[PDB]
């Protein structure tokens, strides 16, 4: 989630993703731990048998055959982690994830119930205000000449500089508010 | 694979900022500065019952056909209170 995808995946990445998915679905098929360990060792043996294949065409052919086999033998109802996409309780707590800027509209009566929190919040907002110009300048100067761009962002290069475009990455609502 | 040095450094800086922010989220000891048994049975199961019984007995029981009940079961050998009739017993069988 934190990292952005690349323009493409390499053969190694595709094979690793297939390996992870195959092992997860194999775990779904073999409910029990010992059986899962046995069959997972067998599956890794199958993967390792072709770990050395310098014919990058017979490698793609093997990968495509493996993907066909996976789509043939996949668990119809695999196991999804409760918090992962498609799993029960995925976006369960998105109702309570109120963004930070909502506190701007609090009545003074409501802010009087948290004197210290808003004192610190003013310091945070002042920090953001100070940093913004320098961070936008850093991005503008970091922009590559050639148009080949990426969503990856630079770290803070000078001192006393926050990483560019940090405010939303920070201050994001907690997972369990 | 693996984080490039720029990714690692940016992750470290964002980690520091995020952890400081989460720490600032802590409430202080004084923070929520708030500004200056038959009781249930009598309150909820007696006063409303007075009101309901009054309404029934003096607005629903006085109107025609407002409360209608199925006839009580009469068996051979019973005495009717109002008319005093005694229902004749049943025929004898093997």
């Amino acid at each position: 989630a934190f990292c952005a995808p690349p323009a493409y995946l390499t053969h190694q990445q595709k094979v690793l993703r297939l390996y992870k998915r195959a092992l997860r679905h194999l775990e779904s098929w073999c409910i029990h731990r010992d059986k899962y360990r046995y069959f997972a060792c067998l599956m890794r043996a199958r993967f390792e048998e072709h770990k050395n294949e310098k014919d990058m065409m017979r490698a793609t052919q093997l990968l495509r055959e493996a993907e066909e086999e996976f789509w043939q033998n996949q668990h119809p109802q695999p196991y999804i982690f409760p918090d992962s996409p498609g799993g029960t309780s995925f976006e369960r707590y998105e109702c309570y994830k109120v963004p930070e800027w909502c506190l701007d509209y609090w009545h003074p009566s409501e802010k009087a119930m948290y004197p210290d929190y808003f004192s610190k919040r003013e310091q945070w907002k002042k920090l953001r205000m100070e940093s913004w110009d320098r961070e936008v300048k850093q991005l503008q100067e970091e922009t590559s000449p050639d148009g080949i761009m990426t969503e990856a962002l630079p770290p803070a290069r000078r001192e006393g500089d926050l990483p560019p475009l940090w405010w939303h990455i920070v201050t994001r609502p907690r997972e369990r508010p | 694979s693996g984080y490039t040095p720029d990714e690692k450094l940016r992750l470290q800086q964002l980690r520091e900022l995020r952890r400081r922010w989460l720490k600032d989220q802590e409430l202080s000891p004084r923070e929520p500065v708030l500004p200056p048994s038959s009781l249930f049975a009598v309150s909820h199961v007696l006063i409303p019952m007075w009101f309901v019984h009054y309404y029934v007995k003096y607005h629903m029981a006085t109107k025609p056909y407002t409360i209608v009940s199925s006839k009580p079961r009469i068996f051979p050998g019973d005495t009717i209170l109002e008319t005093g009739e005694v229902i004749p017993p049943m025929r004898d069988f093997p």
Binding site: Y105, W106, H107, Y117 | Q25, E26, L27
Partner: peptide
């Protein structure tokens, strides 16, 4: 131990 919970302004 007790974290501030961000809420909308319900005062109004």
């Amino acid at each position: 131990k007790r974290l501030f919970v961000v809420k909308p302004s319900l005062y109004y």
